[PDB]
């Protein structure tokens, strides 16, 4: 599994966590989340009512003892060994389609990069990503020709994916806005912010609106949430999400959030889900980003951070989060905040790990907490 991570990044991980831990993390990083979490949209439905609806579709949702709005599904797999060499003709899927097949999705024609020319409909085939990673096994629903020519349609019925997560996008319960797929550490982030109806609240990296709509339902559609993102297209999707979830709490604004104080607004609560190297996202088939990206991105984040701090009222609260594992983007950029009049506060919910040489921040590790790599920092602005 180590091959999914560039050499210098592996050393970085060995240096930051210790060889043994780093090897457990990278191993789990290649696999999907063991517990797949969704958020109960309490604006429309209670948790137990939703559970009833999900069980109707043959789904087995489990309750979270920590998050009353939390449900999760248990991941199936692996369904074959890491060294399994199926005696099958090969279908090569592109990068993105291979990742979804890896988690149980069918393989559709536009996801087909190339294939063995002996494949006819009904043939058992193995699916590999462009680098040879075995991600699934199934039955061809197209001949070779149609498979490499169609623009739509089922190409390979995946009957044995490497891993299985429930597909929830196609459910009535989703279309009715009863839930929103969201990770446990992401949900913790929104709780730890502790939004109040009176609070002036800014989500400066809001799209696609996961945490934004979370805050919404926590406020019970009261008050106002300002939600910012770079492109309107990302906001277009978010408007759809907001509509579906029956959220009436959010004001969308399109802008470079690094220029946030250009608004005449001093906020009480600010959530910065900062753009990051995403080193912690799962599943991680091949890690493309590396050390040069960590440094550059860590520097890139500081402009958001500094913008946030200047837009905060005295005694205001900032929640800083990333889905990355690096020190520079996390503990390092919090030390930057501490030098700029921000104080570390205890978080209302702490079920993860402590930080690296750092006490009140919260981390999530895939091997320990069955989640994505995640970082949560809650700060209080004591002075300018």
Residue numbers in the entry: 5 to 388
Task: Quote the study that presented this structure, word for word.
In this study, we identified that PH1991 is a tRNA:m5C72 MTase NSun6 (PhNSun6). In contrast to hNSun6, which could only methylate four tRNAs with U73, PhNSun6 could catalyze m5C72 formation on eleven PhtRNAs harboring either U73 or G73. PhNSun6, with 12 α-helices and 19 β-strands, is divided into two distinct domains with different sizes: the MTase domain, including an RRM motif (residues 34–79 and residues 173–185) and a Rossmann-fold catalytic core (residues 185–389), and the PUA domain (residues 86–164). The tRNA substrates recognized by PhNSun6 were based on (i) the 3′ CCA terminus, (ii) the target site C72, (iii) U73 or G73, and (iv) the discriminatory base pair C2:G71 at the acceptor stem.
To fully decipher the RNA recognition mechanism of PhNSun6, we obtained the crystal structures of PhNSun6 with and without its cofactors, including apo-PhNSun6, and PhNSun6 complexed with SAM, SFG and SAH, which diffracted to 2.6, 2.5, 2.5 and 2.2 Å, respectively. The PUA domain is inserted into the MTase domain via two linkers: Residues 79–86 and residues 164–173. A non-conserved extension motif (residues 1–34) was observed at the N-terminus. When comparing the structures of PhNSun6 in the apo form and in the form bound with cofactors, the overall structures do not show distinct changes, except that helix α9 moves a slightly toward the cofactors. Although PhNSun6 contains a different RNA recognition motif compared with that in hNSun6, the main structure of PhNSun6 adopts a similar topology to hNSun6 and the two active Cys residues of PhNSun6 are conserved. Some structural differences were observed between PhNSun6 and hNSun6. Second, for the PUA domain, most important difference concerns the change in the orientations of PhNSun6 helix α4 and hNSun6 α5. Third, PhNSun6 lacks the eukaryotic specific Lys-rich loop. Taken together, the structural differences between PhNSun6 and hNSun6 might contribute to the distinct tRNA substrate recognition mechanisms.
